[PDB]
Symmetry: C3
Subunit: 31 residues, 3 copies
């Protein structure tokens, strides 16, 4: 179970960092 | 603890997939 | 491992709630 969770969590961290960068661009009107 | 985590993680996965779809719409100007 | 995960998960929950609020503003044209 634990390694299953660790994989999912690392995958969410990536996805969430991607979402933060996109949303920061939309809020700041970048590019 | 572990099942507590598994629930939270599955809940984040749902929420993150919802955020990806919304942000993809905003970036693409869908609809 | 488990506490390492619990910290990361709580950190994602915060980050995801922040992203939900920002994206809801962008979708609703708030402010």
């Amino acid at each position: 179970e634990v390694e299953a969770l660790e994989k999912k969590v690392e995958a969410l961290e990536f996805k969430v960092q991607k979402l933060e960068k996109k949303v920061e661009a939309l809020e700041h009107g970048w590019d």
